[PDB]
Every structure is written in structure tokens, then in C-alpha cells.
Structure 1
């Protein structure tokens, strides 16, 4: 596995996608709604991605529930992360949501969902009900549940958006000017200390009190804090670098230098090709810890009472608070 995550245009691999997936700088494919028509087509696409690469490769998607669930039709609908703590058995339901989301992805040959959201509060329009709660204990309590469900089916976990995007309220980059973000960061600290996060995705947010760089490209945030002060041992992602530093190669290089193990380039095939063409090849062997640890089909999954219940329970929960 190489450092680079990239994406494809549609439902099937093109000739160019195939040549791209063969390149050892590629380490993963991130999927979107546009890569999804139906269950069968998705299996077919993921099998083609794995064939084209002819080596282990990661397949990921933003499947959080609520406002962020790329694959809905033919899947169990997963509620907004916010809903769990609002039920009377929020921990129980949040673990069901996590296991169910992860289990259905796996049934469809997807390695991981980029989740859970560990941001605190609902006031940032882009986060909103994607957050588990509005205080440290509600977030920890309910994200841990969700995260235990992911782990139970053998899916690696990615906390986002480090060090916390919950308080972001007119430049190329959002700002959070509080002189302390200790509570937001405490959430991330507890999950790291508990050893439950396989990976971390940082926020594209500047915390001026702390550092001039958006956290996603910050040596302070990604190395001094994330590694040194907090002891994170897992995979650090960058933010989407297709969006100061220079062109794609320099941006990719600054992200890697800053402390990312893997970099994402979405929605810009020519920037990705420029990076494939020009970046020296590096291996990211420790990204293999992100490959799903289980294997099964959807109809095997549906034979579990655990599935029959989580599925009915998630639909019920969505109805309750919608």
C-alpha cells in the first residue's frame, strides 16, 4: 500500500482507472454516492478495484449515518449520530448503529467507513447532527458505543476531525479562535488513550492560538500534539489536498512531512495523476492494519438476529426523532 487515496468517476472502472489502481503509490480508493447504483453493482465495482490493484488495497467511504451515508438504497438507513443519546437506551442503540453500519459495508466488500465523528456540539453547520453529543461525556459515551460496534465486526476505526471541528462558527480555510480547545481535545485524548482508534482524520481548521496552519497540514498538530503529547500510534490521514504550499506534489509532500501517513486527493483526477507521476514511491505497510478483518455476504449477515434487530431498531430510531 502506498500513501495515496483517490476516487473514480462512476459505477465501473474505466481503462484509466485500471492503470491508476495498478500504481503502487495508490493505497486506497474512497467511494462516493456517484460510485453507487445498487448492491450487486457495488460488489462488482469493489471486486474490480481489488483485481485492478492486484495487491492488498483499501476501500473506504463516508458512512456515518444521517446526513452522511453514501449508500442508502438497498442498505439499512443509519440515523444521525446525534440521535443515539436522545433515546432512553442510547449506548445500546449506538453500538447497534455502529455494528450495523460496519457489517453492511463489509458484506459489500468495503474495508472501512471514515467514522466516528468525535467533534463536540451542533453549532457548526457542516457538523450539526453528525456529532454524538454537545458535551464531553455524551460524546465519549456514545461514540465509544458506536465504535465498539464497528470493532466487533472487524472494521478499523477513524476518529475525526482532530483536534475538534465542533466550535467552528471567509478565507480559503475555516477558523476556530478559542484560546483553549481542551474539552474538544479531551474527547480525542480519551479515545486514543483507550486504544480504540485505528486511524485519525484531522480538521481543515486553523486554531490561531496554537498554530498558523490548518490542523490537517500542521506539524504542531499532527506531530507535536497527536504523536508526542497524546501518543497516537495509528494511521494519520490528511484532508482532501485537491482543494500557499504549491501544486499537488508539494502539497502532498507538506502533508507527509507534517505527519500524515496517507493523503487524500478527491474530485481531481489530474492532480492525482500528477502526484502518481512525480512523487517518489513510498510504502505504508502499517496501513494494512486498516483492512477489514472479517468476510461475509449480505444474506449470511441477515441471518443474524443481531442484524434483524439492529435494522428494525435503527429505522424505529430515525422515525422517533425525525
Structure 2
């Protein structure tokens, strides 16, 4: 079982089980982790088998992630508790007050993460910290609330729940996707940095302070700060996110599928990304990995490691048998109806 450091590329796979070609690809030093999609999911039993065999290829084990937010962003459905859209928690905040909503967000996080950890998943790419300005359809119900104070506190409560199911969090989309319109393309947020500090960046600050492991940048240009999109901007990622905010976690790149690949990757690392995502294009991963120079980043190993699931298979299966977890499942299922 080869001992290889986790590389700075997050790739993906085609269907329900690894091909021999995928096995060889995932052994390349360039690769440190995998993102799964709905096309990789048939049922719980099959997913466990898939994650186990990904994990087995090398050490430290490849990090496995998925987009389980809730509502209309939940890759794995059959055998999982159906998760409410995050705005449902924003609505509880409005109706029953902040305390009830925090408690509810805690439960949602616990159920979401715990069911994924049972299947060998390390991390869910959640929460959305984007504010509901009432402008962006693609975000839409995925946002907790309009108010940055509610988004922050519900995001923290969700994160505590996620940690009870073994997972860290990944905030998105830095520095804020909520103000642009998004219903079709690369959109423009025309506001000043001061305006974003007052609202959209506040949850990112708060979450970073409280141990958020990772961040995904917005596919959005903010011309008052930089004409480069956030994912390709030294200003956003190094000046603002690292130095000013103090964030020590992973910065994922923008999806590099959109020079060529290699050039797109180099620009992302230069802008300050730790890891680059390359999805639905194993040909580009092949092109990228051949003769690839792993850029100098002594912080990469620890950043990957921080996202490893803290819970073992058996401890999570055991806690899923308890009355307390079953009650959490029923509660969370009820918020999704």
C-alpha cells in the first residue's frame, strides 16, 4: 500500500465502482482527494464499497467529499434522511426565534454528517454563507437568511452538529455570492469592499475564527476590489482571506473545467489556492498530472488532514442505533416535508 502525500488536485470518478484506469489515476502524486456526485451513488451498501476501495489505494487515505447542503443540493437520497433547505432554518429563526433555530441547525448538521460518515465520506461542502439579498436564484433557498448575524449563528450551530457527526465545514462562496443575479455565465458584483465587510464577509470571518476547515470561492468578479474572479485573485485570497481575516484552512479553487489545463492550475496556485478541483473531465486530470510539478506548500498536508473524518465506521453505526439519533433523524425529516 503506497505511502504518498496527498497532492493538490481533487478529482472525481465515473460511476459506482473504480475502473482499473481510475485506480491508476488516483495513485498519481498530484491527486489528494475525490468529490462524489449523484452518478456515483446507487445505495448505502455500494457507496461503502466505493469509499473503502478509494481509501485502500494509498496512505494517507484520499479525502472524499460530497455536496450535501440540503433541499435541492443533496447528492445521495435513497437510505438517507432528506434534509431541509437551509432557508427553512432561517424561517424558524424568524418565527420561533434564534435559539430554537440554532437548536434545529445543530440537529440538521448532526444528521447530515453522521449518515455520510457511516459511508466513509470525510466532508460535506456545507455551509452556504451567502446572504439572501433576494437577487440570486442559483443560491436561492440554499442561503440561511438575509441577515449576516443569522447566517453566521446558524452556520456556527450547523458546524457544531457537523462535528458531532465527525466532519469539519466548508464555507461558500467566499467572499459572497448572494448579491449577484444568478439564473443562467460569469456575473458581476459592483459593490465596494466596505459594503462586503459590513455584511457578506462577516459570516466568513466568524466561521474562520471558529475553526472552519475550508472555503470555496465565488465564480464572481468584484470589479471594485479586482477584475479577476475571487478564485484567481491574490487580493481576495492572500491579502484579504489569509492576512486580514487570518484563515488557516483549505482554499479550494474554482472548477477548472470551465492557456489550457496546467495553465489554469498554475494561476489558481499562484492566486493562493491550496487545492484545485477538476470535475467531469478525467482527460484533463491526465493531461494535468503528466509531468506535474507539485507547488511548494508545506501547509498542504495539515490542511488535508484537518478535513479527515474524526469518527470510525463502528462508532458511527453504533450511535445511529441510539434513540437520541433516531429522534434527530425524525425531527430533521419533518423539517424537509
Which TM-score bucket, shorter chain as reference?
over 0.9
CA distance in 2, matches of 1:239, 1:302: 35
Matched, 1:50 2:55: yes
Residue pairs, 1:61-100, within 5 angstroms: 61-87=66-92, 88=96, 89-100=100-111
Match of 2:223 in 1: 208
Q: Is the 8 A contact 2:107 2:161 kept in 1?
A: yes
Q: Does 2:249 match 1:234?
A: yes
Query: Post-superposition shift, 1:12?
Result: 0.7
Q: Which runs of 4+ in 1 moved over 6 A?
A: none
Deviation at 1:108, TM superposition (A): 0.4
Partner of 2:150, secondary structure, is: helix
What is aligned with 2:126? 115
Q: Which residue in 2 is equivalent to 1:247?
A: 260
Match of 2:181? Answer: 169
Instruction: After TM superposition, give the deviation of residue 200 of structure 1 in Å.
Output: 1.1
Of 126, 141, 154, the residue aligned with 2:166 is 154
CA contact (8 A) 1:85 1:91 kept: no
1:18 equivalent to 2:23? Answer yes
Distance 1:72 1:259 in 2: 35
The answer (yes or no) to whether the contact 2:159–2:168 under 8 Å persists in 1 is: no
Q: Give the structure-1-normalised TM-score.
A: 0.94
Q: CA deviation at 1:80?
A: 0.2
Report the Cα distance in structure 1 between the residues aligned to 2:103 and 2:181, rounded to whole angstroms: 32
How far apart are residue 258 of structure 1 and its match?
0.5
Q: Is the 8 A contact 1:249 1:278 kept in 2?
A: no
Task: Tell me if structure 1 keeps the 8 A contact 2:251–2:274.
Answer: yes
- What residue is the counterpart of 1:36 in the other structure? 41
- For residues 207 and 54 of structure 1, the distance between their equivalents in structure 2, rounded to whole angstroms, comes to 40
Q: Distance in 1 between matches of 2:313 and 2:106?
A: 20
1:299 CA drift (Å): 4.0
1:301 counterpart residue number: 319
Q: CA contact under 8 A between 1:22 and 1:54: conserved in structure 2?
A: no
Deviation at residue 172 of structure 1 after TM alignment: 4.5
Which residue is equivalent to 1:222?
237
**Unmatched 5+ residue regions in structure 2?**
1-5
User: Residue 189 of structure 1 is aligned with which of 187, 201, 205?
Assistant: 205
Residues 1:317 and 2:335 are matched in the alignment:
yes
CA distance in 2, matches of 1:80, 1:60: 19
Conservation of the 8 A alpha-carbon contact between 2:175 and 2:204: yes
Deviation at 1:155, TM superposition (A): 0.8
Does the CA contact (< 8 Å) of 1:206 and 1:213 recur in 2? Answer: yes
Alignment partner of 2:200: what SS? Answer: helix
Distance 2:155 2:272 in 1: 25
Question: For 2:241 and 2:279, how far apart are their aligned partners in 1?
Answer: 24
**Which residue in 1 is equivalent to 2:3?**
none
**What is the number of equivalent residue pairs in this alignment?**
316
